[PDB]
Amino acid sequence: VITMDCLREVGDDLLVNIEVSPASGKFGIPSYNEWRKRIEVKIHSPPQKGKANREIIKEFSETFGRDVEIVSGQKSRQKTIRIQGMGRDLFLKLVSEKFGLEIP
């Protein structure tokens, strides 16, 4: 289930560890784990082809309406999505709102 951390609260921005992908129909972005160091997000087929990078800010930003940026290392697909103007509760809120899941 969803009960792990991954989102980092940094100023008016928030950092999350996931793959290069925003979230298709209904913000679909569960919690991430260090073990996997990779989270599974939901998006279109064009995004999961790489566009997910540019689509992230497109969908991600649209999904919630905030700023997003693929951090970490996209080179290996596994990177960190940095959200600007957002926080932890925010990301979680959407997850709890959309994903209906909360991270304690």
Tab-separated table of C-alpha atoms in Angstrom:
chain	number	residue	atom	x	y	z
A	1	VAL	CA	0.000	0.000	0.000
A	2	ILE	CA	0.972	3.646	0.311
A	3	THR	CA	2.819	4.485	3.506
A	4	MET	CA	6.337	5.367	2.421
A	5	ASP	CA	8.214	8.628	2.013
A	6	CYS	CA	10.005	10.029	-1.014
A	7	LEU	CA	8.858	13.635	-1.146
A	8	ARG	CA	11.295	16.150	0.286
A	9	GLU	CA	9.988	19.411	1.696
A	10	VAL	CA	12.347	22.122	0.508
A	11	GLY	CA	11.118	25.688	0.824
A	12	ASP	CA	8.110	26.625	-1.271
A	13	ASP	CA	9.172	23.649	-3.353
A	14	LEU	CA	9.055	19.900	-2.843
A	15	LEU	CA	11.294	17.130	-4.123
A	16	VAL	CA	10.015	13.647	-4.869
A	17	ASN	CA	11.810	10.525	-6.035
A	18	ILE	CA	10.064	8.931	-8.990
A	19	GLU	CA	10.369	8.163	-12.684
A	20	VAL	CA	10.190	10.664	-15.519
A	21	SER	CA	6.417	10.851	-15.740
A	22	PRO	CA	3.660	13.164	-14.487
A	23	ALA	CA	0.338	11.376	-14.189
A	24	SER	CA	-2.351	10.513	-16.710
A	25	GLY	CA	-6.089	10.621	-16.123
A	26	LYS	CA	-6.336	11.332	-12.413
A	27	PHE	CA	-3.013	12.216	-10.832
A	28	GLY	CA	-1.545	8.763	-10.344
A	29	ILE	CA	1.635	8.995	-8.305
A	30	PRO	CA	2.035	6.656	-5.323
A	31	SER	CA	4.754	6.765	-2.691
A	32	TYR	CA	8.340	5.871	-3.505
A	33	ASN	CA	10.801	3.656	-1.672
A	34	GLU	CA	14.579	3.719	-1.447
A	35	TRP	CA	14.767	-0.030	-1.934
A	36	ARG	CA	13.221	0.433	-5.359
A	37	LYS	CA	14.500	3.989	-5.572
A	38	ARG	CA	11.865	4.151	-8.283
A	39	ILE	CA	8.161	4.919	-8.138
A	40	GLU	CA	5.514	3.951	-10.663
A	41	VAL	CA	3.572	6.887	-12.054
A	42	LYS	CA	0.623	6.881	-14.426
A	43	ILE	CA	0.734	8.672	-17.758
A	44	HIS	CA	0.071	8.306	-21.467
A	45	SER	CA	2.021	6.088	-23.834
A	46	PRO	CA	3.894	9.001	-25.423
A	47	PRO	CA	5.182	10.110	-22.012
A	48	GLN	CA	6.407	6.677	-20.994
A	49	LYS	CA	8.440	6.919	-24.178
A	50	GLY	CA	10.485	9.817	-22.857
A	51	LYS	CA	8.074	12.689	-23.364
A	52	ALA	CA	7.062	11.934	-19.796
A	53	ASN	CA	9.855	14.386	-19.079
A	54	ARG	CA	8.287	17.353	-20.828
A	55	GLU	CA	4.846	15.871	-20.284
A	56	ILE	CA	5.517	15.816	-16.560
A	57	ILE	CA	5.379	19.586	-16.264
A	58	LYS	CA	2.515	19.344	-18.726
A	59	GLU	CA	0.460	16.766	-16.866
A	60	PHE	CA	2.014	16.975	-13.421
A	61	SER	CA	1.660	20.743	-13.459
A	62	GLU	CA	-1.811	20.290	-14.900
A	63	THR	CA	-2.712	17.399	-12.628
A	64	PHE	CA	-2.176	19.561	-9.567
A	65	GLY	CA	-1.418	22.920	-11.136
A	66	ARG	CA	2.056	23.338	-9.694
A	67	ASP	CA	5.583	23.308	-11.068
A	68	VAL	CA	7.523	20.107	-11.628
A	69	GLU	CA	11.010	19.177	-12.771
A	70	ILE	CA	12.802	15.882	-13.273
A	71	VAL	CA	15.783	15.886	-10.941
A	72	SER	CA	18.051	13.084	-9.787
A	73	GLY	CA	19.247	11.387	-12.951
A	74	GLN	CA	16.856	10.918	-15.848
A	75	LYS	CA	19.751	9.424	-17.773
A	76	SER	CA	18.939	6.203	-15.959
A	77	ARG	CA	15.230	6.950	-16.054
A	78	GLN	CA	15.324	6.924	-12.270
A	79	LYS	CA	15.375	10.535	-11.139
A	80	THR	CA	13.709	12.903	-8.701
A	81	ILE	CA	10.703	15.044	-9.541
A	82	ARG	CA	11.166	18.486	-8.037
A	83	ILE	CA	7.925	20.370	-7.514
A	84	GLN	CA	8.046	24.137	-7.159
A	85	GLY	CA	5.583	26.048	-5.012
A	86	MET	CA	4.461	22.705	-3.635
A	87	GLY	CA	5.226	20.815	-0.446
A	88	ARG	CA	4.795	17.381	1.085
A	89	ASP	CA	1.191	17.547	2.230
A	90	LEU	CA	0.458	18.991	-1.192
A	91	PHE	CA	1.821	16.050	-3.148
A	92	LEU	CA	0.315	13.714	-0.577
A	93	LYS	CA	-2.957	15.616	-0.616
A	94	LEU	CA	-3.284	14.981	-4.333
A	95	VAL	CA	-2.228	11.392	-3.749
A	96	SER	CA	-4.738	11.096	-0.933
A	97	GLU	CA	-7.282	12.998	-2.992
A	98	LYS	CA	-6.649	11.252	-6.290
A	99	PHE	CA	-4.772	8.179	-5.126
A	100	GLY	CA	-6.967	8.267	-2.043
A	101	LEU	CA	-3.829	7.171	-0.233
A	102	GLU	CA	-1.963	8.963	2.529
A	103	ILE	CA	1.637	8.689	3.667
A	104	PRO	CA	2.154	8.800	7.440
